[PDB]
């Protein structure tokens, strides 16, 4: 395969995401490592799907709301700042204030 | 011109009468005084103030009152206060709190805490900063419990341990000299601060003696290895000799005496009580009642710790686990059941609320929790908040009175105990810096940046292939104060007088800083600050119920807490 | 009631800046074709050359703003800024080297200014 | 007998007049010249032709001209040539570049580069050889970045750092004595070579030169700690006393100056001109015309490079973020701002090509990634064949020419720039054996095997517990070469000559490979191999437009690169 | 996210939880470190979704039969113990003899 | 669960071709480390199952087509190779030239 560091660690990124989503669909609000997970592999897959940088700073405004999340977490997330290869190289997305 | 209060805190941290909440708790910090000049703030960045003939002075060699490290707009919470601060650092020691900056152009600088050429900066606007916390019941299991320690703001290790020898995973015990030599050599691998129990049992003082002087930094008398009149007092009298602290864990069945047995084999002399409510260990059911007596310097560990709907049924087979016994056997069974009462649990919550027990600790790996030492303190106090009030000595509708009392707790009163405070537990000048940098979202969850001798040993941090620090994953990781030989300068292995004076270090090629243990035996529970209350605690050995001044002390426990499931993956 | 972690309830005011300094406004114009932004704490006297100003006014003081923010001139603009009195032991040293010991030699710096084209000495 | 050109590559790699392709670019590179003799190829395995009496000599000693690594078959990329040939290390440095084997029964073996007892085989047929990656723009930030680095091939990182302190999450700088001294002995746990810079900020020289002194490499000017004419000044007078290089990012805010006036502090000097395009940094919007001057040594940072439809929108946040800015003060927005401009990225493309930019760097983690140096320089030459067409100068349908002026720019040329280039930075006899292996297929996206000093480091193997190690997972891997006390003497740690002088590496007790900076103030852009353009460079104040010649340096951005989606997980 | 070591850790059940699951649902009989991981997995996520400890002491014991597990599996287990945030924080689960 | 640690690596196999079985299924066309984790876990699954090495030999080319790949993946992949416990212990699977 021959993985990088980088490639590795973000492994776990998809892994967290995915263990979030399963919470989500039993019924839990979220919590504040649950929802940077999944609003971080969605940024990931956005880019491996081949969407340009601006295109995921917008949709990553609206992968959760507030009624997904506990008290207080929209609150907590200001940021959320993800790296992936898209077609054009690395790329750095930031998105501000995710969940209203 | 003038800034709004809202404002000002954003660009440079709170300020007088500014109250912070603590992560998602009821409590709330007051800012109690600034040392900054309004307008001469010292902030680090492009077009910032700390730049060359501005807020840096341009003039001065690092000897000429030049800093190391400057860490910016601090919200320094700790026994001595709770106030902002610029904190300078220089060779690996705080040496300035005040205010930071050029004496060329600012007000109100601090003399020794001039920006120079040599001083890196550390932006501290919006954290609070506490000293690192010590841990004084470490059983050295799994190295890997170091990074779970720096990662909840753990700086110290006392305890012991040879790794998962039943002995170790029983008690904080490295036995003799050969292993003592074995585990300080070990130690220069670990980058915490450690120091080393030996075994205090014998009836003879010179096996009890020769581990003193190998590199032990204090005993450990525990009733797995017999916890008996004769190997109390024979510690005690090793102790006294060479300024090392003992702590107990006594007769829980009461096989050899009772309680008031083990106070006349002790005879007055300062003692460290473990788990002073005796789920941990302890003469059964009546051990907290130590807590009341003058010479007795008592801690708490973290299961117990607050009072919760679950923690009675977590505890039976974690005890049988912890030591060695079989659920086949009825009197062990019996023994592990006399240890778990929620009567004393209660009181316990109780008992730190008012200062009768002074210190936390975790009981690492041996029931206990390595990484939740800090985080457990603050729960209590919120609990406590909740059931009691504020305390009748607050004001402002502030929690400070509450929050030095709890802060000294993992901080500055095991650091007395352990006879370290003289290089360890506060934020205070003349001492190792040892910081932790906590976001208030976070505080006593997860540390973001732990410094540990004037440089950053973990921290919070994000992809180490990006742009920026800043972009997922951002976990726990170790930085360059734990990587080569600056580890060996980063952290203190502390040490008895006696192996010091015998040349212990250079005989085992130690390249770790070395910190002298003293002033052990002329302390007692007067000396824990915000903790020093005596009392007559009278435990009613058929029901169980503990009282203080002719009051029961009891409460109720919760269904929830704070700093738990809005913050953990699992 | 909802709880927000870690967050502030300020107390009532407001807080004044550099209270208890001298204050001084003056007019300062970009006449240059690149956009010039200046510190709340350099010597104003030592700015870029090409800012026209009343160099005299600059000397011994700095932007009358909170630390760590800044005054930017575009390419031909003219603005008023306030300018505060520095502080501490009143010695500048380095930056563009016009002062390099006290600010009150005001002869000296002026007469190294001029040499050097800092414009708006009179 | 004759053999078909087809299946000669196959066997023994590509031979004279042979074309490769650079993973799934466009660029193809030519076999120049071959070193070997055609039926005497060095080669090793079950039946093959190193063996004793055979290709091995089994007569001569170590010291009697036998090496103790050959690489085998090399297909060599470097800016003295593309070519095919053996090559031996003895001592952990390249001794031989030519025919290795044995003179007993084989023509035209090299007299150095006998096979003996002593000599370890490394098969490098297929694969292209380069010499390790120089990056001289690195942030200490997180120690997680040395694998990031060491997988894209690069073996030597200068800058400088504490951890993720806002200084150097800022800037390159280790600043002062006493940071100096703890960031070399952390280097002595770092599997990689380092060189630090000091702070180059000053009015005076004793703060400035007692870094240096202290074992400093070299110095940076930041902007973020006032790069103002007098730090300028200061640093390159202490600069050309030491004989180190001076880097400097300039005052984008033009505070003290616009760029004829940096340019007048440095009076003629020798500097290093961190990311010459301005995106990461300097005097706004023309800070790119310092690549123009003769004492100038221009280095691009990666993330301009090349230029992509993507690379504007993810720039401001980076920024903000590195330079610790705050999103609500206008003027920290506009300072941002100022420092994004297409048509300065466009023209540096355009500069890289015409070898008017001499250097890549990384800037890793405060806007720039560990590990795309490489990545990144192929991108930017695979854009540019695409957009301007094959280069005047070359020859056979061949890239060669454009390879060797890109080779340069993250080998030899901040190796030049550094004053380490008699140890580092390009495929020569003399000089420490840092080599990288690539696959042809995997050219400059991941590393097959790092050598560092003639033994791997580093290396993308499979399963350790497998029968063979090229089972999955195939992996970066720290290899021997990292393990115990050999990071010792496969690592360079390298300093100034007073701090050489003064014993600082005793003092301290490093036991790494102590390198001597040296010859950084008698060089000039002239000094720079395949990139020695010196020009008038315009750009416009109004419109940014960049001219060279009277013409306006412009290309599009593009949609896609190669060594991207194809490789990698993320 | 903040992940702390233990989170890291943990990721590493839920994902074997999850291969172990894949390898039931195709008719395997499971072994030892799948019948654990799977135990272990229910355990963590009934803390999250906020069972008590006692529930999960007595839950555990219904995961998987005999009938799920190669020969002598249920024998190797004497207990499974996993500790994970509940409402009330951190607490040990301990399971007895989960397989009968 | 005992794990040891080729056990823990190969968790991380699982992963990624599990992360890349989700790219193919919403329409991607897969690269050279998304492939070759497919491939390897289709291998260690098949010896959980219970197939011999010859059989994984021979189903190991006809797990990916070159339709389902990127230009270039099906000529990069000169062989895959995996070890995993089969009913008779540890084996390695060569699998030759797996994508035509
Ligand atoms: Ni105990
Ligand atoms: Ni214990
Ligand atoms: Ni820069
Ligand atoms: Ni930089």
Chains 1, 5, 6 share one sequence.
Not at chain 2, 479 to 505: A, C, E, R, W
């Amino acid at each position: 395969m021959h993985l990088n560091p980088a490639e590795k660690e973000k492994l776990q990124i998809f892994l967290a995401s995915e263990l979030a989503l399963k919470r989500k669909a039993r019924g839990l609000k979220l919590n504040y490592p649950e929802a940077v997970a999944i609003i971080t592999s969605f940024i990931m897959e956005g880019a491996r799907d081949g969407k340009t940088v601006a295109m995921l700073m917008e949709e990553g405004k609206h992968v959760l709301t507030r009624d997904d999340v506990m008290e207080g977490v929209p609150e907590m997330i200001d940021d959320i700042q993800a790296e992936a290869t898209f077609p054009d190289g690395t790329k750095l997305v930031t998105v501000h204030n995710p969940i209203s | 011109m003038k800034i709004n209060r809202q404002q000002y805190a954003e660009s440079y941290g709170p300020t007088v009468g500014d109250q912070v909440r603590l992560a998602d708790t009821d409590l709330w910090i007051e800012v109690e005084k600034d040392y900054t000049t309004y307008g001469d703030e010292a902030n680090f960045g492009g077009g910032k103030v700390l730049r060359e003939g501005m807020g840096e002075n341009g003039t001065y060699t690092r000897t000429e009152n030049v800093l190391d490290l400057l860490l910016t707009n601090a919200l320094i919470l700790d026994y001595t206060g709770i106030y902002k601060a610029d904190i300078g650092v220089k060779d690996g020691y705080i040496v300035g709190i005040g205010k930071g900056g050029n004496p060329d152009i600012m007000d109100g600088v601090t003399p020794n805490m001039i920006v120079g050429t040599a001083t890196e900066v550390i932006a501290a606007e919006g954290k609070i900063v506490t000293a690192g916390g010590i841990d004084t019941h470490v059983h050295f299991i799994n190295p890997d419990q170091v990074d779970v320690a720096l990662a909840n703001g753990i700086t110290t290790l006392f305890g012991g341990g040879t790794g998962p020898a039943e002995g170790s995973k029983a008690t904080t015990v490295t036995p003799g000299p050969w292993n003592i030599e074995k585990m300080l050599k070990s130690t220069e691998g670990l980058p915490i601060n450690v120091g080393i129990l030996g075994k205090g049992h014998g009836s003879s003082i010179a096996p009890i003696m020769e581990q003193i002087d190998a590199g032990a930094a204090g005993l450990k008398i525990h009733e797995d290895w017999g916890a008996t009149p004769a190997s109390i007092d024979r510690s005690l009298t090793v102790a006294d000799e060479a300024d090392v602290q003992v702590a107990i864990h006594s007769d829980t069945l009461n096989e050899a005496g009772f309680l008031e047995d083990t106070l006349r084999a002790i005879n007055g002399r300062v003692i460290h009580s473990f788990h002073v409510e005796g789920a941990g260990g302890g003469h059964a059911p009546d051990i907290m009642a130590m807590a009341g007596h003058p010479n007795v310097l008592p801690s708490s560990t973290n299961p117990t710790r607050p009072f919760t709907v679950n923690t009675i049924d977590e505890h039976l087979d974690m005890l049988m686990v912890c030591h060695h016994l079989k659920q086949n056997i009825p009197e062990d069974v019996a023994f592990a059941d006399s240890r778990i009462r929620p009567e004393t649990i209660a009181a316990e919550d109780i008992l730190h609320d008012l200062g009768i027990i002074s210190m936390m600790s975790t009981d690492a790996l041996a029931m206990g929790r390595a990484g939740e030492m800090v985080l457990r303190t603050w729960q209590t106090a919120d609990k406590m908040k909740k059931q009691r009030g504020p305390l009748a000595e607050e004001k402002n509708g502030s929690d400070n009175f509450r929050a030095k009392r709890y802060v000294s707790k993992y901080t500055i009163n095991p650091a007395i105990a352990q006879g370290i405070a003289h290089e360890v537990g506060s934020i205070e000048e003349g001492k190792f810096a040892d910081l932790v940098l906590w976001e208030p979202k976070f505080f006593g969850v997860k540390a973001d940046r732990v410094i540990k001798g004037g440089i950053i040993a973990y921290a919070q941090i994000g992809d180490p292939s990006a742009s920026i620090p800043t972009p997922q994953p951002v976990m726990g990781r170790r930085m360059y104060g734990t990587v080569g030989d600056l580890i060996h300068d980063t952290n203190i292995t502390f040490m008895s007088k006696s192996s010091i004076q015998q040349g212990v270090p250079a005989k085992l090629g130690l390249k770790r800083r070395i910190g002298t243990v003293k002033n052990c035996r002329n302390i007692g529970k007067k000396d824990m600050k915000w903790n020093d209350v005596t009392t007559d605690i009278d435990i009613n050995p058929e029901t169980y119920e503990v009282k203080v001044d002719g009051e029961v002390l009891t409460c109720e426990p919760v269904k929830e807490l704070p700093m738990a499931q809005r913050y953990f993956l699992f | 009631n909802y709880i927000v972690p870690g967050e502030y309830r300020v107390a009532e005011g407001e807080i004044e800046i550099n209270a208890g300094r001298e204050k001084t406004t003056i007019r300062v114009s970009n006449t240059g074709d690149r956009p010039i932004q200046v510190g709340s704490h350099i010597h104003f006297v030592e700015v870029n050359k090409e800012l026209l100003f009343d160099r005299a006014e600059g000397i011994g003081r700095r932007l009358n703003i909170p630390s760590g923010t800044a005054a930017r001139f575009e390419p031909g603009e003219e603005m008023e800024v306030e300018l505060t009195e520095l502080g501490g032991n009143r010695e500048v040293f380095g930056i563009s080297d016009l002062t390099n010991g006290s600010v009150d030699n005001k002869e000296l710096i002026l007469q190294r200014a001029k040499e050097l084209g800092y414009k708006g000495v009179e």
